Amino acid sequence: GFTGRKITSQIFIGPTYYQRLKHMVDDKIHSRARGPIQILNRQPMEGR
């Protein structure tokens, strides 16, 4: 795609069935900076 030169090997091509999974990149990202604090432990709380 970049060079335009022929790829020396021959790539195996064809349609196939893929699926999208529940596990999202947006749902799994998480960052914390001195936010909410647990009442008992006086520590950071349990998850995003």
Add this chain to the structure above:
Amino acid sequence: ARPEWMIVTVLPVPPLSVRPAVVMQRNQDDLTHKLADIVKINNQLR
């Protein structure tokens, strides 16, 4: 440490930091309920 100290005759009551209580957005911690039962039975026996 002494054997008289080792057997218990006065029970230490922990502060509310040990046994926090929170209102729903006043529920008591279960340790608070248990030590309340302790002092209730102590008063009954008294």
Add this chain to the structure above:
RNA sequence: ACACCCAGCCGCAA
């Protein structure tokens, strides 16, 4: 100047 209490259970991620 924030607002949401906790136990239990279950499913699930690598």
